[PDB]
Amino acid sequence: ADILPANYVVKDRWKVLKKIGGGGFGEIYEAMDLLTRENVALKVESAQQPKQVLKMEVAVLKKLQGKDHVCRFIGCGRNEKFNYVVMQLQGRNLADLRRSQPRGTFTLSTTLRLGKQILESIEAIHSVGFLHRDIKPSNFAMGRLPSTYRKCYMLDFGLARQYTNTTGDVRPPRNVAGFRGTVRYASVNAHKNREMGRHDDLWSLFYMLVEFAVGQLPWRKIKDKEQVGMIKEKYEHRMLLKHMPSEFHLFLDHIASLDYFTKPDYQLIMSVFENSMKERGIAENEAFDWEKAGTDA
Ligand SMILES: CC(C)(O)C#Cc1ccc2[nH]cc(-c3ccnc(N)n3)c2c1
Structure with missing residues (x-):
């Protein structure tokens, strides 16, 4: 069903608590950052998915770092199963x-x-x-x-x-x-x-x-x-x-x-x-x- 299970740890660091959003495109999770002890937003896209859009999303987010009214970028990565981006959790x-x-x-x-x-x-x-x-x-x-x-x-x-x-x-x-x-x-x-x-x-x-x-x-x-x-x-x-x-x-x-x-x-x-x-x-x-x-x- 979901790309990541409940309690899934990404790169030994970001542990899924729950899914807070998703559609055709990809899914968004609330995660515990095991390094900082802060809750973060984790957005994931299937590695196979015919349209690879997360790559472009991260590039935009990165260009905007330092502007006001932009999520702080924390990390990203790629494996055989999914691509992902970690950003500061908002309300x-x-x-x-x-x-x-x-x-x-x-x-x-x-x-x-x-x-x-x-x-x-x-x-x-x-x-x-x-x-x-x-x-x-x-x-x-x-x-x-x-x-x-x-x-x-x-x-x-x-x-x-x-x-x-x-x-x-x-x-x-x-x-x-x-x-x-x-x-x-x-x-x-x-x-x-x-x-x-x-x-x-x-x-x-x-x-x-x-x-x-x-x-x-x-x-x-x-x-x-x-x-x-x-x-x-x-x-x-x-x-x-x-x-x-x-x-x-x-x-x-x-x-x-x-x-x-x-x-x-x-x-x-x-x-x-x-x-x-x-x-x-x-x-x-x-x-x-x-x-x-x-x-x-
Ligand atoms: C900027 C980028 C990487 O393209 C993105 C996104 C996105 C999409 C759908 C979403 N639905 C909810 C959130 C969310 C909720 C809380 N805190 C943060 N940082 N996100 C969320 C974030």
Whole structure:
């Protein structure tokens, strides 16, 4: 069934406690690090599996080491049965935290402050020549330590693609590129099976923040890829912002203006979040909604 059993020790060092995630791609375990005495995340991929994707995931994670909002890399390896990566263990993902909120909504305070962090992570992965291509709330996790629990960390590079060649140029888009990310947060371009660009990661961010602040997207009950693309294509997006800060029109109009070839104005989007906080007197060091101060006073 699973690749690693319960109590399996990888490289004499990382001992499986339980499976915390998995699909077609590979599986993710919580492990005890026998050297450091710390719990770690262990992600594994079958050595035979026809698509060898973990190799690319580790390469991305390694390039990003030293950026904020990135899991600390601990180790990786390869044998006859599986490839694996060991990374610092984070806490709960934003989909789990949003569904724990009484109405499935975050405050503007939580929404805007998570937005700044996710924006920073998107620019970071773009800055080392990669698209995420599956930006969604379950791919961000809060830290679990006193130094990290107010930090949001980007996970799961399993659908990432290098958008540059080996010498830093933007590579030519394929005329058709089959979109295989999550329906709910996919850009209209993704829905049309266009080559995805940096802008398409920022669309996914746009839709996440609306959904955080409002509790839902208009197409939430529709799972069909094609039906959802047809709804988004027609949807008057300025209407998503009816109950959002007016600065979010600057965000919408910007990413609407972008194409596959054009570098986003990340600072423009950051200033939207920053101006939206400043207008409502929102301080950076406020409790997140899920904290004792956040779930109380
Ligand atoms: C960055 C990389 C190597 O591509 C990755 C991943 C990934 C995918 C799916 C996952 N599901 C849950 C986690 C997870 C949970 C807690 N703490 C950490 N570091 N992860 C998780 C991590």
